[PDB]
Design brief:
part of a larger assembly, 3 chains, A alpha/beta (440), B mainly alpha (67), C alpha/beta (421), B: 67 residues, 1 helix, C: 421 residues, alpha/beta, 60s Ribosomal Protein L30, Chain: A, Helix Hairpins, 3 domains, 10-stranded mixed β-sheet, 15 helices, binds guanosine-5'-triphosphate, binds the ligand CCOc1ccc(-c2cn(C)nc2-c2cc(OC)c(OC)c(OC)c2)cc1, binds calcium ion, binds magnesium ion, Stathmin-4 (chain B)
Amino acid sequence: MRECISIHVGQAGVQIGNACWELYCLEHGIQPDGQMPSDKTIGGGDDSFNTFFSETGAGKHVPRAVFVDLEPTVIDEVRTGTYRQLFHPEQLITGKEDAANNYARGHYTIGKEIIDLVLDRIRKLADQCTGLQGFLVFHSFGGGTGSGFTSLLMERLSVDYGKKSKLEFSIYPAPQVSTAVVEPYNSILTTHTTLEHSDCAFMVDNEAIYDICRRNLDIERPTYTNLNRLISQIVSSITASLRFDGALNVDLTEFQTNLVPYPRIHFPLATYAPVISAEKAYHEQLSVAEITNACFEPANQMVKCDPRHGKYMACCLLYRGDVVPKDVNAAIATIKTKRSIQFVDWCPTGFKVGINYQPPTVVPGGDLAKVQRAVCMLSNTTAIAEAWARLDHKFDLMYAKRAFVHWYVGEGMEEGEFSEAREDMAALEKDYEEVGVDSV
Amino acid sequence: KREHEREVIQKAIEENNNFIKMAKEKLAQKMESNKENREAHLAAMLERLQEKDKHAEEVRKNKELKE
Amino acid sequence: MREIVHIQAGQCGNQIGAKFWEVISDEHGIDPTGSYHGDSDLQLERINVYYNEATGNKYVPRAILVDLEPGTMDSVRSGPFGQIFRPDNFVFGQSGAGNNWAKGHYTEGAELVDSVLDVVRKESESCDCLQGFQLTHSLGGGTGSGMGTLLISKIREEYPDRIMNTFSVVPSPKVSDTVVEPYNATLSVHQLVENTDETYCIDNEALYDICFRTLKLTTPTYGDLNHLVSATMSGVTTCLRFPGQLNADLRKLAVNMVPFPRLHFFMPGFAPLLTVPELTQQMFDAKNMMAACDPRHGRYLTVAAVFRGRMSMKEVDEQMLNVQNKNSSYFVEWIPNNVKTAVCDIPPRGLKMSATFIGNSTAIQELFKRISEQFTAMFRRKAFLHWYTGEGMDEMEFTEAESNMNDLVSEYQQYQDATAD
Ligand SMILES: Nc1nc2c(ncn2[C@@H]2O[C@H](COP(=O)(O)OP(=O)(O)OP(=O)(O)O)[C@@H](O)[C@H]2O)c(=O)[nH]1
Ligand SMILES: Nc1nc2c(ncn2[C@@H]2O[C@H](COP(=O)(O)OP(=O)(O)OP(=O)(O)O)[C@@H](O)[C@H]2O)c(=O)[nH]1
Ligand SMILES: CCOc1ccc(-c2cn(C)nc2-c2cc(OC)c(OC)c(OC)c2)cc1
Ligand SMILES: [Ca+2]
Ligand SMILES: [Mg+2]
Ligand SMILES: [Mg+2]
């Protein structure tokens, strides 16, 4: 038990789920039809991979997951594609008309027509569980479904499942990849209405994933497939602790004890290494010391900010592959002297370490080189408030003129909901400022 | 100490329940306030289109009643 | 969302509409009988948008052909793709409009409107998921100008939550010298500001000037103007018609292009009338606008750009950034990331690389100002009013249409003058 149900909402979520679940199957030796040759307990089992996969009596390993989108085009590619056999048809849910980059349509208008059906389908997965731990929610900040329907869902799950944990993987918008003019509005609106209901949320700046693919994989104009295949490795590093046996494996809830000092301060900075092309990795083995040092190079962050001009409240290192305690300890000692790591005066300055032995895999015909070891750092830095700042400014520029606000008011929202949300964001920026201040 | 042990777990339930209650209600307030607002918008839109028809009946009578 | 329902009203609407249907049928691999003779799966993937699937794999436009004058029914049917249209979708009147908006909107066209609506209701009901409507018409004539803006209004009553596009052909002396077109445009504009979600201002003065100056033609026909109008109409529907990695529906376009609900009058553009930096500089150049305005006389609230053909997408990203950087003053600072760019693999027939431009610029006031001047020339001496007041209208309605169009200008100016701090 300790089961974990994944919900993928809107295109971004759905497409990142395809990446994530493809990757999980390659990590656990699961085939596209769902069969696991290495699994000897037919029909059920109490294994670590069973946290993400249930088993049928026939031996099909089925993701504990739901895919929702308010229009069929993106989910229809799952329904006809390589892993169509992996999912039961009722895990894949669609409407006919999308939310049209409108939080109002995703949360209310189109959203209220399908919410009950979704919760009914989540509930059928929950009843397969003997000891449900919580939910992982994959969505974009920018989209109408990704913002609006997610918020609606998060509120409703808080009702049906009380305080049972809910983690987010949020895709923070950036103009390099597709963006719309109103994504700042949707971003602030969903971040406000979800903040009470999310226990921990890993933001992913598309610009950050864009720059990394360009710089490190030498990809000229990265596609969503490029970005999602990188993202899913970061998602896999965080969830690896839940899916694998391990002597030196720290569970993801134990890291969360350290990562969340107050409930609103639940936004960790993910940083991953190595991201390297097959061309460059040839005759080039990257040690524990090298990949650990890369975690403090801010060009490897999932979110663009500067931790060096902020303050740490937590530092966690999630190694996978050929790693042992000794080297990690040497590597951290090196870093402590040579690098710009200031903690707040109220937190202890240790680094919390976990290690999985199962080494990191890659998607066949991918861009990432196969490496022997890897690491995902999860830090709680005040610097991440910079992401809220950049987004809050864009919100303010349009809201000053009420630009596009009629599309939201047309679908039933009030102007009060914008200012209410924005003031919550103003408070959140002030909270991240207050925690950094020294005590008296 | 025994009565304090029960006072803590009762409080743990109380606030867990209270969070579900005020979430459940705050969501109901929004979905009702929204549906009222959305229909208020579509009722005013249709009332301006129904006012256009009554004007087009005054124009069609001013042709007939000017001969 | 997928299906659009097309409507062509009056003569202009039916001819530019006919051209549109020839061109997009060519691009989707459709012949005048209505059979898929193509090669790529991309041609069919979003065919439902503009076509119904009749038996025997027959592809039939979702178009509703309308006019108060017959003979336009014949010329459309005799024309290259006249066969492909559905026979009951023709809904034609008797005596015509004679360049009278009051006849089209209030009296004569008001009789025919119900049997037009029946064809709409029959087509709309058979859509899997109706997204919206598009009207091809002119604001200078009688039927398309008047009965078009009634159909807009009437379709809005039964489908108030669907998108309403128009390709409104704005009148010009240089092309057509009827004396009361300024009255008809100003009356139409009064309906369009209230009852549409987005209107493509296709301007005849821009079309004449491009035909004369750029395309070298000494005195151009309606065929030469419509080569352009078809290429423009081909460009802005490209994203709806083909896949790409953008989805593209009318709502998301409308949402992103229209910052305020009145200010929905786009300035289309096309290039060439070749390399990427040239293309990019060509489409933002004032000579390539299908409306008679200079982008350098206002600011861009929002812009959408569509490139077609094989080309470095890395080079297009770099180039569109370049023109925003170098021309930062001509976009509003208070709407971030307000120029979006899609690319379609499949180019149009004839060209290897085209580029199509849609801009909601405050410089559009220049067009409305031109129509207001030609209007107010006549109206302030009461000239030619008997045509209209004969058909039953008040003078009040000319003042309210004059006032509402001047409000639209004043509002485009308000936001041109708006600043960040
Ligand atoms: N990393 C990543 N970002 C994506 C992907 N697809 C969309 N996005 C981003 O998500 C935002 C747009 O939201 P989507 O998730 O596409 O929209 P949606 O949730 O389907 O909402 P509607 O289509 O409006 O109902 C933009 O910021 C895009 O850059 C993806 O596959 N990967
Ligand atoms: N660009 C372009 N403009 C046209 C075309 N045909 C007509 N026009 C313009 O349309 C305006 C007059 O409107 P029409 O569409 O001809 O008239 P109508 O709407 O059919 O109204 P009635 O003739 O009164 O029934 C004039 O300003 C013409 O320049 C065309 O093929 N291309
Ligand atoms: C300045 C803001 O402009 C935008 C932003 C986004 C979109 C859009 C979003 N989707 C999912 N699809 C479109 C889109 C874009 C187009 O051109 C770039 C289209 O061609 C006109 C289109 O067809 C309707 C949709 C649009 C504008
Ligand atoms: Ca088992
Ligand atoms: Mg979508
Ligand atoms: Mg005619």
